[PDB]
Amino acid sequence: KVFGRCELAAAMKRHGLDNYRGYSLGNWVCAAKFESNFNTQATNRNTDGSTDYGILQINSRWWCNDGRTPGSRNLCNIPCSALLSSDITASVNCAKKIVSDGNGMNAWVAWRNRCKGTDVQAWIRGCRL
Ligand SMILES: [Cl-]
Ligand code: NA
DSSP states (O other), X not given: OXXXXXXXXXXXXXXTOTTBTTBOHHHXXXXXXXXXXXXXXXXXXXXXXXXXXXXXXXXXXXXXXXXXXXXXXXXXOSBGGGGGSSSOHHHHHHHHHHHHTTTGGGGSHHHHHHTTTSOXXXXXXXXXX
């Protein structure tokens, strides 16, 4: 499913992401925009053979099992395919563990490079939240 900007902001906010660990809602929407273009079905393969899955491009090297990343962890204890659902619940719950592991949203390279230090509130401007 391809989300609308405000549609996704609303879903993220209902799932507890607003100001989660100090990251305002615009941070999460900005990250999703540049990680996946708001597409829950986005997948991208990394050079080391792991794959990033879903709206937040969660990596199979650490966070989910896709059966083809040898020597990887499954810290969110879910199959990576559950992160491509139109329901963003699993992506959101997994994102909550990732952002809590000590590096904050720097775990998302697109957020670090494209959202960090910008006016992220502009990503929820105009939305009915
Ligand atoms: Cl980037
Ligand atoms: Na894995």
